[PDB]
Amino acid sequence: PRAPRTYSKTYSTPKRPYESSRLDAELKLAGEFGLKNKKEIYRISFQLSKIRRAARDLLTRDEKDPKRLFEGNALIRRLVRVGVLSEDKKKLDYVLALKVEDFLERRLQTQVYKLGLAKSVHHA
């Protein structure tokens, strides 16, 4: 048969289904960034955890390691290019300390409201 086309999940559900603090925080994010579901928040948390795990397994490698160097530059440059990382700090500490709110505010849906084409995030 043909080669298997690879597919992967892009989100992960929370471990505890009913946490008041988590539910309130996620509803706050949904309301103030105009998101349809909590699956969007789960997806952004999934990507953030992926890149944080990459950064942590990078830091566990010694300094001047070719792998640590190259992968740090790649990850930091990608984060800077998308705009969730600072445009002046390649310390990778911020790479271990990004935020879901930063990713949401970098998303386009709020970008239209920021640049002033929307007048409301739901209009955007």
Partner 1 sequence: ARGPKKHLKRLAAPHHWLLDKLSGCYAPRPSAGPHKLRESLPLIVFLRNRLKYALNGREVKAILMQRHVKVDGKVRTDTTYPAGFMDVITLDATNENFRLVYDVKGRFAVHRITDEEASYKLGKVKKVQLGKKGVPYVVTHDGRTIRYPDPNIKVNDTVKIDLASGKITDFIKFDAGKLVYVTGGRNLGRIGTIVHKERHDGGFDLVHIKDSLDNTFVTRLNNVFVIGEQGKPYISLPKGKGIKLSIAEERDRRRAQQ
Interface positions with RNA (CB under 7 A): 1-10, 12-13, 15-17, 49-50, 52-54, 56, 67, 70-71, 74-75, 77-78
Q: Is the dihedral of CA 32, 34, 39, 43 positive or negative?
A: negative
Binding partner 1 (rule: CB under 8 A), the pick from 27, 69, 82, 117 is 69
Identity of the residue, 34 or 72, whose beta carbon is nearer to partner 1 in the bound complex: 72
How far, CA to CA in Å, does 96 sit from each of 19, 36, 75?
25, 28, 11
Question: Could you give the CA distance from residue 1 to residue 13 in angstroms, rounded to a whole number?
Answer: 34
Token reading at 79? 């984060």
Smallest distance, Å, CB 84 to partner 1? 22
Whose tokens are 């949401």? That residue is 104
- Residue 3 interacting with partner 1 (CB under 8 A): yes
Binding at 116: pick from partner 1, RNA, none (beta carbon under 5-8 Å per type): none
70 binds partner 1 (CB under 8 A): yes
CA separation for the pair 68, 49 (Å, rounded): 18
69 binds, among partner 1, RNA, none (CB under 5 to 8 A by kind): partner 1
Q: Which residue has the tokens 């008041």?
A: 20
| Contact positions vs partner 1 (CB under 8 A) | 1-3, 5, 66, 69-70, 73
